[PDB]
Amino acid sequence: MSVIAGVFGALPPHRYSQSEITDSFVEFPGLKEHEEIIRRLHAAAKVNGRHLVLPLQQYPSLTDFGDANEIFIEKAVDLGVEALLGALDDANLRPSDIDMIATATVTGVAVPSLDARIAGRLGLRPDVRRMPLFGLGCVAGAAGVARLRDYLRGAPDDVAVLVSVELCSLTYPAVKPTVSSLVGTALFGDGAAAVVAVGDRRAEQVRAGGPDILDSRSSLYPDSLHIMGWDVGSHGLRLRLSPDLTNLIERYLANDVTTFLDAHRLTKDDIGAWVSHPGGPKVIDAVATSLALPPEALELTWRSLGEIGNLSSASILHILRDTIEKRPPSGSAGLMLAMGPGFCTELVLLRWR
Amino acid sequence: SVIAGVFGALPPHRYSQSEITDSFVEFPGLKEHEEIIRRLHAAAKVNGRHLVLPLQQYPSLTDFGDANEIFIEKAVDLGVEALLGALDDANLRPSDIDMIATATVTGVAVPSLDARIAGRLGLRPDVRRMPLFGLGCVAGAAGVARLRDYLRGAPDDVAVLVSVELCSLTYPAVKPTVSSLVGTALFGDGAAAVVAVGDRRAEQVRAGGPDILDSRSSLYPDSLHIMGWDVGSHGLRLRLSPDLTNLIERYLANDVTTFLDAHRLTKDDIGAWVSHPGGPKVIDAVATSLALPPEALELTWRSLGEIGNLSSASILHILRDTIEKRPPSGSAGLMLAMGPGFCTELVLLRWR
């Protein structure tokens, strides 16, 4: 039941327009033959830009999972300590201060994990507690905040941090011109995010500013492991994405947000700030649709989607910051809502103050 | 937070060390390394291991895509088997579970195993998932420590950890090298589960395992190189350092001494040491740096013998071994582990 003190988003210095990404992408070896679907898909995404970790003309030559994953380890680390520092400074705090650190990626594999590495680089205390969260995916933005709270609930003098870093570009080695992967090449970008939360008691001493994390609720939809995730093989991390995903949302997401809110004597009309994860236009439309929501509401999410792409688990944090920035109106409540492999969902109840 | 159930689970197939080595030297290429493998395999002091697959099938397992595929299959079955076993020990149902945490380092699944487990068991659709990868063999002690950390913010809840390690299946990445040959002598397959319950819920449920009083993690400066996965095209390649033992000899005594002094205890107040069996040379270093007579470590020694090093799962087999030995009441106990990081986790237990 504890309170965010800092949010920060980092991203590769190379921003490319979507048309530039496409104009070039179609000219990639073995792709020109699928120009038509590529153009349409990259234009269907409502993504105007994307930071990439490498120069755009280097991906065509990135084809070994072994190479790309070493690039990941080198590259994820540095965006992370950049994102952590940004948040620690937002929170008027220092590395020594951190008692636990959760790490979220689904986009490369690292052992020892990112947190160990980011712990080495920032000089965090040797006895920092490490929670490297893998295989949660796009929902680890909301889920990562949850495990944070769950931790500070029973440790109110404490400082916990969540670093999300997803470098989708580097999964290229396993991208072939089939619909799922191509949907992938239309939406996903590279980015990092960090959140610094603190105890209620600790909150008053370092004057936290973010809202509080009041409650959470996971929701794991059954018989639906296939809806998304990775097929993992010698060629890297192969994006598995199903069309059935929007269907599941519309038929159950209303139910979830109703039971989570009710348990707080609340209706969907009290939440004065939504922070929703942008899986892509049809997903953002389905959720707007299911929850009977006017467009004012998900506006920061479409605008984040247009500006940085889909960043997996880092997006919601980027949007989280976007809305924090726009200071709602003191007392109001808010609702993170993320979804990812499972298939599953995550709602975080938030109060601003 | 207090332990309620511990249970270990094995694949049906067992094979003695000599039976494994005799076949292993056959495998292609491998016959021209027959000396060292025989040397290495004997000095692992491992007498038998449970391989998830039939022995003469590995030589054909050359693809990491195939291996990871089979991993996901055998890994859930085996983890359910474990969770079910610990859940029964506790006399609790899968539907009583509030949090599930998962330790694997040997296969990459997204969605995590814990999701695939949570479905196979019909755990509540709102159960909290905490997949962890890759903590390494530290992950049994470290996971028990996240449990405490969870339940301590929720005293009425039921949390579980399930660790599943299928090391034989990394095999598409082993080559004729000392460090991949080492791991070939050491690591076996298996799984284990721990159910812990929160304070306010412990009486109401008859919680019999040890209370958990605290843990201490210890990340060593500039030490990535010591333990980890070389990830790539052929799968997960073991990378293990000989410098290892000389990190232990260096900083272990200070790790535990520091932990214990926080509780104003001495090493002499611990009677039962719960130790990770990373093979003979590592276990000596541990007996040596903390001066524990051959008595204090005997359950791990035997475990490394019967079962092999099962990565993050062994320490939970030993924690179960020691508990069924059922320690003096109120006496006190120490879990100690080490994985990739390079790091150390210490868990102070109190028997009941």
UniProtKB/Swiss-Prot annotation, chain A:
Domain of life: Bacteria
UniProt-recorded Gene Ontology molecular function terms: acyltransferase activity, transferring groups other than amino-acyl groups
Primary enzyme class: transferase
This protein's record includes keyword Transferase: yes
Record InterPro entries: Chalcone/stilbene_synt_C, Chalcone/stilbene_synt_N, Polyketide_synthase_type-III, Thiolase-like
Protein keywords: Acyltransferase, Fatty acid metabolism, Lipid metabolism, Transferase
UniProt-listed Gene3D superfamilies: 3.40.47.10
Keyword set includes RNA-binding: no
EC number(s) stated in the UniProt entry for this protein: 2.3.1.-
Pfam hit, one: Chal_sti_synt_C
A GO biological process held by the record: polyketide biosynthetic process
Binding site for substrate: 180, 241, 277-282, 312
Known pathway: Lipid metabolism; fatty acid biosynthesis
Family of the protein in this entry: Belongs to the thiolase-like superfamily. Chalcone/stilbene synthases family.
Role summary: Involved in the biosynthesis of methyl-branched alkylpyrones. Pks11 catalyzes the extension of medium- and long-chain aliphatic acyl-CoA substrates by using malonyl-CoA and methylmalonyl-CoA as extender molecules to synthesize polyketide products. Palmitoyl-CoA or a similar long chain fatty acid derivative is the likely substrate in vivo.
Subunit structure: Homodimer.
Entry protein name: Methyl-branched alkylpyrone synthesis polyketide synthase-like Pks11
Organism of origin: Mycobacterium tuberculosis (strain CDC 1551 / Oshkosh)
Organism ancestry: Bacteria, Bacillati, Actinomycetota, Actinomycetes, Mycobacteriales
Gene designation: pks11
